[PDB]
Amino acid sequence: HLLKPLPADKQIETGPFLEAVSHLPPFFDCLGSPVFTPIKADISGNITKIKAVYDTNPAKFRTLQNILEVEKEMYGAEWPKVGATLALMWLKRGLRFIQVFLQSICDGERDENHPNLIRVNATKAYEMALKKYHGWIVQKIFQAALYAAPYKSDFLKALSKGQNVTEEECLEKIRLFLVNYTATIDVIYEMYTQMNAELNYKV
Ligand SMILES: CCCCCCCC/C=C\CCCCCCCC(=O)N[C@@H](CO[C@@H]1O[C@H](CO)[C@@H](O)[C@H](O)[C@H]1O)[C@H](O)/C=C/CCCCCCCCCCCCC
Numbered sequence: 001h002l003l004k005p006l007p008a009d010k011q012i013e014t015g016p017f018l019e020a021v022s023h024l025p026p027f028f029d030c031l032g033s034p035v036f037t038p039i040k041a042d043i044s045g046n047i048t049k050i051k052a053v054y055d056t057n058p059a060k061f062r063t064l065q066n067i068l069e070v071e072k073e074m075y076g077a078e079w080p081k082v083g084a085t086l087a088l089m090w091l092k093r094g095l096r097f098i099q100v101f102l103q104s105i106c107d108g109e110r111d112e113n114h115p116n117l118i119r120v121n122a123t124k125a126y127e128m129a130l131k132k133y134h135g136w137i138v139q140k141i142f143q144a145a146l147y148a149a150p151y152k153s154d155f156l157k158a159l160s161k162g163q164n165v166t167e168e169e170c171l172e173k174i175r176l177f178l179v180n181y182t183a184t185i186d187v188i189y190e191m192y193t194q195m196n197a198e199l200n201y202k203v
């Protein structure tokens, strides 16, 4: 299934969002390299934390905007470096990395001298989504992941394990997934900017 479409007023229901993005971390089990373990843990850990907050009062935390706004009231000067707000601040970055990476691949972006690597696509996604927030030690993790990254064809076979679809059919399904996914992430970014909740610290 696809993510829910964005409503006209751009308020994103928490429950459906968490349920949908909860399907993303299992993909990492298809990628054998040791770095995918802490990557999966990071993404899943943030999902878990936002879910834990949501579950304390689903009515009050019905939308992601509710989460930020209510946490701001709950935590005073500790906000936004607190709670589900912090978890979602980092989740959105992981989700944008995925967005940019997959979009790049689907649009045929490549290094003409290495057309079956995915380095250029991962580098674009990293620069757009994560690099500004990573100190050198974490950047080394990215660099090592790049070196060991699967070939494009292998990667796409993993995305479509279970489906028996062609590479081109796999890309078409990703393009459709990307529609509501991209729109939703863009709203989450806007929300953090509007609330002055984007933090710029490096890890
Ligand atoms: C259709 C479905 C498609 C699925 C396909 C998925 C393919 C995706 C591949 C990789 C996704 C990578 C996402 C990584 C997100 C990392 C977020 C991050 O920077 N989290 C930080 C901060 O952590 C935060 O610290 C905070 C406190 O300061 C805490 O409060 C937070 O809870 C905590 O999250 C953490 O320090 C870093 C974790 C790992 C960084 C990995 C760097 C890049 C990975 C290499 C990618 C190459 C891909 C090649 C293709 C296979």
Ligand code: NI
Residues within 6 Å of the ligand: 001, 019, 020, 023
């Ligand atoms: Ni689902």
